[PDB]
Design a binder for this molecule. Sequence first.
Ligand SMILES: [Ca+2]
Lengths: 393, 393
Amino acid sequence: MNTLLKQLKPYPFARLHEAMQGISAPEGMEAVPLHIGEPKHPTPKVITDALTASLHELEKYPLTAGLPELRQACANWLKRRYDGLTVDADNEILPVLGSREALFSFVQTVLNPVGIKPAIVSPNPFYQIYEGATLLGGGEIHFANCPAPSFNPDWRSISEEVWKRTKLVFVCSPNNPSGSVLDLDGWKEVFDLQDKYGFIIASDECYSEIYFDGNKPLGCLQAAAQLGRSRQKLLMFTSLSKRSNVPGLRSGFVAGDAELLKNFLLYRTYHGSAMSIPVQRASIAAWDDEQHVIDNRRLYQEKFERVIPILQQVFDVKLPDASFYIWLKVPDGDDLAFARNLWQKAAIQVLPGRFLARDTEQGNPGEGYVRIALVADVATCVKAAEDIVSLYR
Amino acid sequence: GMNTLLKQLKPYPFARLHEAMQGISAPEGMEAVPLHIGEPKHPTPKVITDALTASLHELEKYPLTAGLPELRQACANWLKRRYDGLTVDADNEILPVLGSREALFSFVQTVLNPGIKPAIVSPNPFYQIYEGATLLGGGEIHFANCPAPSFNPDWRSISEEVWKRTKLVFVCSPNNPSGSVLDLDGWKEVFDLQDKYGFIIASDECYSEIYFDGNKPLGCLQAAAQLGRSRQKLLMFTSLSKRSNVPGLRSGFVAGDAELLKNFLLYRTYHGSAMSIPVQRASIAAWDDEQHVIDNRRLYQEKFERVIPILQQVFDVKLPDASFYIWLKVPDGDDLAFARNLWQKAAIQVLPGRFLARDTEQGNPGEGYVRIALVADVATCVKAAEDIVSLYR
Ligand SMILES: [Ca+2]
């Protein structure tokens, strides 16, 4: 049982808590939680109205594939969002109970060791789920480092021997933590590798709606369409969590290769991941409405518009491609000391970049950075930015 | 391999009735009577929907996988009320789960870690998930047949060779389809086998609240207490789906061995099975209230009170121990021909017992029975019973 469970590594939050033990913030000073990776904006009424109005439907077991009208709301949203992209609600979309369970379960189906040990390639810095899902599925995790200035994945670091047994590659776009959006050239590179080696691509696009000034992030399926490529062995994973301020609703979808999804659905019927009908109705309301999403982007953009210039007094920093993070370069390279000093002097919590990345033969690509989330209100973000500058100017 | 197994598995027996009716039509102008499906049809109570609506602002937050202290305590409090003072620690012996299906499936995956092929033992007739979870986890499924008149599992049909490789045993009590509640002698037997061979016991108790005349079914944890035994390697799985007519809520809990649950919780943080806070609130309301459960139980009591004596005019049948099923012995032994005749003559849908069982060295213990679910209203059930009897006069 505990053989694979024993290989799991502590979560970033836990590493930060341990690192801060014995370091005291100023007496009476409220902690400023910039280290978190979750939204703080309130849930929109359009979603909660739809949930409440359908609660009688709790009396019914939902089918794993979901209501036709939920799959169609996702197909309609895809068309609006990705400039006419046509994805078949009947064959290319499954609702998921948040992207976390979907990513984990899909990986379990992809990894079936017997035998050559199968590999999965993740960006580095990574999202902890990519590693854990791989370890618990009996796979071997490998890391494509994402160095500045583009923070795109360096696939060349991965040997031919590893590529030959690689069953899946993760892309996170927009990236947590770097904000980077993989562009057409980056997608073409990974598609060329896929033609060579035959792995599945899983693209985690949960930050697709968090962007600035009309500069919409390119998605995987859109990139494929722009390059005239089929959806074979391509899957996008997305969520209402960041888009719609409903991390608690546990609702998203997976879309792409109909052949992959046909078999994933069969598995999911046993894995027990069918969506509550009232949750489906709330989700339809969410995917159908853009006003709450527009309002959401406006809140984030206002924060960056104030915070970036404040931080530029002292730091080498610019607006990220997308997402609500700043991946801040630490001037002397010591992300741990940076976090300690901010906590001791201002009760400000930031996440050391090295806790989001693994050591490699080429170093740890999270060292020298901290992750800051602009999820609190603008006054809180501005005060923090000013306090940080005051400590480093 | 994965895909061929998924193509083979049939997660929903009720669907197999259709192929078996092939080209037999029900009479013109007769509404089909669905007694073949193992799912409730009573409405969701207001006490639950009220609590859900009241807490919808909490969709803005990510829930922790372990759940709110107050949900685990509501479960602990319910257990104490239900099992005559049973004391189970909310801090370490209870995890909330998103319906028992995902819980049973994921727990099995963690137990199976395959050169010696691990075994799991299931009752026969069985519940679909037991077979799927085992096979998808790389385990070998073995069957303890449940023959009349007790329908308790016959453990001695499992060889010592299999027992030595057995990692988990399922108990379903009250049983689907037989209604049988494993008693103190039956629990003692499986406990003694556990002491000998060291497997984990997983007890599926989702029908615990559907019973008659004040005769509350014994549960696994209560049986251990009564026999002076610890909870080591014991886990009960339960759900609000049947108790509270909220199968769509996707809510239950698992309780028992704290060490098992510690490891299960770690896995579940990656597996992505944390409960929406508003669903947790609705669930607290559900576990805290008994009036809606008393009302629900009274609906089923009325149905059985009227149906059993009608059927007894022609069939060898009695009130089951619990559950909403009648496991009806077919006079001539041909359960397929029985279901076909009821459909062709009366539009009545019952489930051939062979569809819930696998064949063994001791025959298919589903053959010669049909499962009838009393989930439709009393008037419909009574008329169905009368119509069945007149066809078998
Ligand atoms: Ca697998």
